[PDB]
């Protein structure tokens, strides 16, 4: 069931993903993956590619995927080791996880996360208050942080 469900998924990430999001198998196992957002328009984080490790749990689809940021970012809910506060990657009843999603769609979500931020949720306070209070000093350091660790 749970092998039979990866197969399903890393088929259609393979070929049809979504706009801007690429998914890959690292090694020779279905629960160790790997994948790439690109940095959206209208966004700091533009012209940026940002890679992410996605662990698939044994109890998969009934616990969500565990994903980090490898690059570095600068945003309200995502701290220094790449954790990102998000209600798609929690169980409820705090969190939004159910079987009817997949890898595919939280990716997605990580993505409009990254062009819309929710600091009312915070995991970095000092860069939350920045962006509700001095928003043009939050843009700065973002591209910045982006241009230094997102590219070349
Ligand atoms: N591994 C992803 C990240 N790494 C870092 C390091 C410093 C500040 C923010 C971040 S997000």
């Given at each position: 069931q749970?092998?039979?469900?990866?197969?399903?998924?890393?088929?259609?990430?393979?070929?049809?993903?979504?706009?801007?999001?690429?998914?890959?198998?690292?090694?020779d196992?279905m629960?160790?993956?790997?994948?790439?957002?690109?940095?959206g328009?209208?966004?700091?984080?533009?012209?940026?590619?940002?890679?992410?490790?996605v662990?698939?749990?044994?109890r998969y689809?009934?616990?969500?995927?565990?994903?980090?940021?490898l690059?570095?970012?600068?945003?309200?809910?995502?701290?220094?080791?790449?954790?990102?506060?998000?209600?798609?990657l929690?169980?409820?009843p705090?969190?939004?996880?159910?079987?009817?999603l997949?890898?595919?769609?939280?990716?997605?979500?990580?993505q409009?996360?990254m062009?819309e931020?929710?600091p009312?949720?915070?995991l970095?306070?000092?860069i939350?208050?920045?962006?509700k209070?001095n928003?043009?000093?939050?843009?700065?350091?973002?591209?910045?942080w982006?241009?230094?660790?997102?590219?070349?």
């Amino acid at each position: 069931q749970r092998a039979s469900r990866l197969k399903r998924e890393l088929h259609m990430l393979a070929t049809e993903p979504p706009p801007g999001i690429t998914c890959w198998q690292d090694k020779d196992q279905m629960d160790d993956l790997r994948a790439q957002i690109l940095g959206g328009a209208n966004t700091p984080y533009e012209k940026g590619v940002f890679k992410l490790e996605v662990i698939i749990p044994e109890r998969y689809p009934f616990e969500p995927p565990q994903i980090r940021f490898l690059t570095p970012i600068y945003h309200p809910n995502i701290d220094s080791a790449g954790r990102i506060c998000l209600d798609v990657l929690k169980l409820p009843p705090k969190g939004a996880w159910r079987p009817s999603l997949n890898i595919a769609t939280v990716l997605t979500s990580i993505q409009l996360l990254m062009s819309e931020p929710n600091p009312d949720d915070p995991l970095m306070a000092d860069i939350s208050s920045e962006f509700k209070y001095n928003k043009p000093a939050f843009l700065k350091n973002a591209r910045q942080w982006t241009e230094k660790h997102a590219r070349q």
